């Protein structure tokens, strides 16, 4: 019935995933009066805000060595390579990551919960990417790719189709990018927050995974 949910999440979840979860959660009559406050940020900022209880729940990347935090699979993304339409790689439709070795990257900053996965991909193929600059949020990244300031590896998100960039699928190496519903282990959680948590986990299994 009544209550508030403070939900923090990583940037790319704002465009479609969180709205879809909230829309479907709230069509149930007994959820109409539940309210939210929504916070956006990078995984490394979000984890402290879970521990200090600013957030009831979070949607973010998995983080190693956080035994106080429960990470439960919610959705997934596809990593792609994004280049300006004039770039030499734009002639291709798919590439191996090692094919990018010569080119300057717009790289995610260390705050990004994506960097463990990305770094492991480059380590797997023994490539040390040329990093031209760092950015945290995704629209700033594709913005810089669109003026050919560099290339990037990033999640395939709907906005990429609206910049003057070519999106390339990655053949090798292989990857899965999972996104998690994160919460404090052994912690008291309000009835509304628990209702949203269970709802979102069911929804992700049925529709996202």
């Amino acid at each position: 019935s009544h209550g508030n949910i403070d939900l923090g999440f990583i940037y790319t979840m704002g465009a479609h995933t969180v709205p879809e979860l909230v829309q479907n959660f709230t069509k149930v009559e007994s959820h109409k009066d539940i309210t939210f406050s929504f916070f956006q940020g990078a995984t490394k900022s979000i984890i402290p805000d879970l521990k200090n209880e600013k957030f009831d729940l979070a949607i973010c990347s998995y983080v190693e060595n956080e035994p106080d935090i429960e990470f439960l699979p919610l959705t997934k993304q596809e990593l792609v390579v994004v280049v300006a339409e004039n770039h030499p790689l734009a002639k291709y439709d798919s590439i191996d990551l090692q094919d990018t070795a010569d080119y300057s990257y717009i790289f995610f900053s260390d705050t990004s919960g994506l960097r463990p996965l990305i770094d492991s991909l480059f380590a797997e193929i023994n490539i040390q990417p040329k990093i031209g600059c760092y950015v945290e949020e995704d629209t700033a990244m594709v913005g810089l790719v669109s003026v050919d300031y560099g290339i990037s590896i990033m999640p395939k998100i709907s906005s990429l189709a609206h910049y003057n960039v070519k999106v390339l699928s990655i053949n090798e190496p292989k990857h899965d990018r999972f996104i998690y519903l994160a919460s404090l282990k052994n912690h008291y959680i309000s009835p509304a927050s628990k209702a949203f948590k269970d709802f979102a986990l069911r929804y992700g299994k049925k529709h996202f995974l």
């Binding site: 998995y62 190693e64 699979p73 997934k76 899965d176 999972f178 998690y180 992700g204 299994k205 995974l209």
Partner: peptide, 9 residues
């Protein structure tokens, strides 16, 4: 389907 896979670390 991918839920189980997502639990592996």
């Amino acid at each position: 389907g991918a839920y189980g896979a997502g639990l592996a670390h």
